[PDB]
Amino acid sequence: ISKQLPQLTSLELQYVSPKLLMCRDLELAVPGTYDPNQPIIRIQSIAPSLQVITSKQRPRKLTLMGSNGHEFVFLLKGHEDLRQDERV
Amino acid sequence: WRMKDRMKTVSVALVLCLNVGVDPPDVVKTTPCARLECWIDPLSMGPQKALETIGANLQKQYENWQPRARYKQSLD
Amino acid sequence: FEIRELAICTVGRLSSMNPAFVMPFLRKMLIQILTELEHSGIGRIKEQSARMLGHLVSNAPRLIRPYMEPILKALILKLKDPNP
Amino acid sequence: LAERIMRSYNCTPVSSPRLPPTYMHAMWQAWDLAVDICLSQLPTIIEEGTAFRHSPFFAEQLTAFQVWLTMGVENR
Amino acid sequence: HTMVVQAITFIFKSLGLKCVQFLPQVMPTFLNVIRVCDGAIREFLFQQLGMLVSFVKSHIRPYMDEIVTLMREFWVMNTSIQSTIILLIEQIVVALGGEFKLYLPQLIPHMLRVFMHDNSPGRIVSIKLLAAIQLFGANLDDYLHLLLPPIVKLFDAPEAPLPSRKAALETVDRLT
Known part of the structure; x- marks a missing residue:
């Protein structure tokens, strides 16, 4: 697995999780985007490919598509607490 | 009608000058271009791993027709 | 064109005696007739194409039966277009 | 098959013993017909799960052979 | 118009295949x-x-x-x-x-109309379209039945000019 790890440059949803590839026109709102005043930006679809950043934690590069047509890029952090960052 | 002789393909040599991840200067491929080599996408699994996997897959494809042969793969 | 129609009628009638040799050729001629009808924007050519299709339907029901959906869809699209 | 497929893309595969062209032979029409018949049941095979009915290609060809034999006495 | 378009074509030609x-x-x-x-x-x-x-x-x-x-x-x-x-x-x-061959069916009706009615002096337009059909090559397999009868009539009509009929014969010979 140590030898295999560098080769995992990018992850395709069809292998890792076909359910997310299935997801289409979800009423579920884009994370960190809901506002009581502004219209709800619900998820339209998730991109099939995730570009893993070659770092120690190997954070993914997720990108959603909102109902308004504007891409929302995010980083999937693993094995690190983000509640502190939320409070900050 | 008698067969004069019966020959056998004892060995198979697979030279694969794929050069994964590098485009030859002679041809400037289009942005989509053609990426399927032996039903394997080289860019998905990294250059060297793709080269070895394509070689193994091609060996299997040839073995489908002639299983009994010494297959030796040359990769670049 | 009349000789053409008679030839296709005879071939379609022979689709039962020698299916191995008739069915593929009739399929190819069905391909050519359908594309001729769909693409040729000429009244006379489309007349002959539709007449050929009718003869093929009458004489080779076994050949055309699997292709009922495409043949009907093409005929529908022609029927919805904006010669008698 | 390589010759037939590559002809449509302005490519002529070459063999050291020059084979006469075979892209226009009538049997390829039978090949297309048999493929169309065989794979037309695939939606029901995968989704509904029907029983694969064997293609009538060989039966029809043997019927044609019988028709030829019926009146093939002459050395035609 | 002409200045900028000529400049664009010249730049693409000088660049070569990097112009993509x-x-x-x-x-x-x-x-x-x-x-x-x-x-x-x-x-x-x-x-x-x-x-x-x-x-x-x-x-x-x-x-x-x-x-x-x-x-x-x-x-x-x-x-x-x-x-x-x-x-x-x-x-x-x-x-x-x-x-x-994908886009050939779209242009086919225009060629058919050109073959049917062409009053150009000497049918030079028909001859040039014949040259284009010659250049088509293997893409014409699925539409040869469409293109051929126009050419057959072109070289079978006595009233058609000799250069045009000769061009039709050469086109059929090439497609052969």
Whole structure:
């Protein structure tokens, strides 16, 4: 697995999780985007490919598509607490 | 009608000058271009791993027709 | 064109005696007739194409039966277009 | 098959013993017909799960052979 | 118009096959320009577009459908426009090759009409279209039954000019 790890440059949803590839026109709102005043930006679809950043934690590069047509890029952090960052 | 002789393909040599991840200067491929080599996408699994996997897959494809042969793969 | 129609009628009638040799050729001629009808924007050519299709339907029901959906869809699209 | 497929893309595969062209032979029409018949049941095979009915290609060809034999006495 | 278009064609020619980089920048505006053009600039634009297609070869596929739509819209009885579009067709086929069979059915009706009614002196338009059909090659397999009877009538009609009938015979001989 140590030898295999560098080769995992990018992850395709069809292998890792076909359910997310299935997801289409979800009423579920884009994370960190809901506002009581502004219209709800619900998820339209998730991109099939995730570009893993070659770092120690190997954070993914997720990108959603909102109902308004504007891409929302995010980083999937693993094995690190983000509640502190939320409070900050 | 008698067969004069019966020959056998004892060995198979697979030279694969794929050069994964590098485009030859002679041809400037289009942005989509053609990426399927032996039903394997080289860019998905990294250059060297793709080269070895394509070689193994091609060996299997040839073995489908002639299983009994010494297959030796040359990769670049 | 009349000789053409008679030839296709005879071939379609022979689709039962020698299916191995008739069915593929009739399929190819069905391909050519359908594309001729769909693409040729000429009244006379489309007349002959539709007449050929009718003869093929009458004489080779076994050949055309699997292709009922495409043949009907093409005929529908022609029927919805904006010669008698 | 390589010759037939590559002809449509302005490519002529070459063999050291020059084979006469075979892209226009009538049997390829039978090949297309048999493929169309065989794979037309695939939606029901995968989704509904029907029983694969064997293609009538060989039966029809043997019927044609019988028709030829019926009146093939002459050395035609 | 002519100055900038000539400059674009010269730059693409000098660059060679590296010009594919500028295709997304050039092609959409170019097609809109030909659409909104008027007068004698149209034929020059089609000629330069044909030169551009020759330089771009196989990379013109994404814009090929739009180019075909423009040619269908702007194809008329005018002899000059017919000749220019025929030359553009020749460049398109020598650029694409196998993939041209996809867009051939769209242009087929115009060729059929040209064969049916052509009053050009000596049927030179018909002869040039015959040359284009010669250049088509293997893409004509699925439409030979469509194109052939026009040519058969062309070289079987006694009233047709001898050069035109000879061109039809040569075209059939080549397609053979």
